[PDB]
């Protein structure tokens, strides 16, 4: 059977005859136990399980030139929304169930790294 991303959060399964499977439209963001700001960024099939990348529209990160923990989530602005990778499986039609959930933490910064970063400058992104 084939999987179809209906929107930024739901996934519907279709049979080989191009017909949808009834009661297969699954909200994987909810199933992954993640809030409304999250949306599926990428999906892949390994083993027989579905692997899904999620990322929040509410994420806020900070850079402080001083200290040891130079890169971190802006907890103060309700932007402590890290990305996650979730493994999903079939317990059945199609019924999804979460296997493993992996968070994507911010990078670790060394004193040698922070000396460059301190004065690191970036050009505005190229647009259409």
């Amino acid at each position: 059977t084939f999987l179809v991303k209906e929107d930024s959060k739901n996934v519907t399964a279709y049979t080989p005859f191009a017909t949808p499977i009834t009661d297969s439209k699954s909200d994987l963001v909810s199933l992954a136990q993640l809030d409304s700001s999250y949306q599926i960024a990428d999906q892949t099939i390994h083993n027989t399980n579905l692997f899904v990348l999620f990322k929040s529209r509410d994420v806020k990160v900070k850079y402080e030139s001083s200290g040891s923990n130079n890169i971190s989530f802006d907890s103060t602005s309700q932007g402590e929304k890290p990305s996650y990778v979730v493994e999903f499986t079939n317990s059945t039609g199609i019924k999804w169930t979460m296997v493993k959930k992996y968070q994507l933490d911010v990078p670790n910064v060394s004193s040698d790294m922070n000396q460059v970063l301190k004065n690191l400058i970036l050009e505005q992104p190229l647009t259409k």
């Binding site: 049979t15 005859f17 017909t19 499977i21």
Partner: protein, 50 residues
């Protein structure tokens, strides 16, 4: 009746009798009374799409 000599029983039928349509399951006079058959009404095929 014990020797096998007797009278035939009669069932009245409405209208004009012309013939009978006999299948290995049913005998219908003038081909009237054809039904779906109650036994096999709960048995069907799984559609190819699913």
């Amino acid at each position: 009746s014990e020797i096998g000599i007797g009278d035939s029983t009669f069932t009245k039928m409405d209208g004009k009798l012309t013939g009978v349509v006999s299948t290995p399951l049913v005998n219908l006079i003038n081909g009237q009374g054809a039904t779906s058959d109650s036994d096999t009404e709960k048995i069907s095929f799984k559609p190819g799409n699913q």
